[PDB]
Design a protein around this ligand. Structure first.
Ligand code: SAH
Length: 173
């Protein structure tokens, strides 16, 4: 028979969210950048690491989701805008460094060229060697290898996620 809720249209599992938030160093003194917070399940796992709410910046395109996040997570620096336009959402880069980037934007909704460019821009705003972590659902990295720009590592696989979740991490080469 025909299954409902095909694809990835339910919130990410709490098991997956905790694993993505485990890359964070809450003792580094640097804020965290979250992309595409949605219902806030990964936001919760980020705050559970002990990040001060004012030190979490989360960029959400949907105005409906954004208005609800403001009311559910007091103190967190939510921004209503497009994560692929970091200049418009974060401002022109003038030195701000994030501890790490936690991304759940749906990479496959965008051209590969856009994904590579965004990743190259995000790695300018974290210290050399620190990660971007991305969730995806296919068998391969959602962002193709460009070894002169970044290094790809498989981070984890969570079969209890609906659908099963692959986690990838990226660092500056
Ligand atoms: N370019 C973009 N910039 C900011 N947010 C985006 C975006 N494209 C998609 N989004 C938002 O990213 C989220 C993808 S769904 C994942 C939501 C949540 N983090 C979870 O894991 O369950 C949606 O909330 C969507 O509105």
């Amino acid at each position: 028979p025909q299954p409902k809720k095909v694809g990835a249209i339910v919130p990410t599992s709490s098991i997956t969210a905790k694993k993505m938030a485990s890359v964070i160093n809450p003792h580094s003194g640097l804020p965290v950048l979250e992309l595409g917070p949605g219902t806030g399940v990964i936001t919760k796992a980020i705050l559970a690491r002990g990040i001060k709410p004012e030190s979490l910046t989360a960029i959400e395109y949907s105005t409906d989701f954004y208005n609800q996040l403001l009311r559910s997570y007091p103190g967190v620096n939510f921004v209503n805008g497009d994560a692929f336009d970091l200049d418009a959402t974060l401002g022109e880069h003038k030195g701000q460094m994030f501890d790490s980037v936690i991304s759940a934007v749906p990479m496959l909704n965008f051209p590969m060229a856009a994904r590579i460019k965004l990743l190259d821009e995000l790695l300018k705003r974290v210290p050399h060697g620190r990660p971007v972590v991305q969730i995806s659902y296919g068998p391969i990295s959602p962002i193709v290898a460009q070894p002169h720009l970044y290094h790809i590592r498989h981070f984890d696989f969570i079969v209890r996620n609906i659908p099963p979740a692959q986690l990838w991490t990226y660092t500056r080469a």
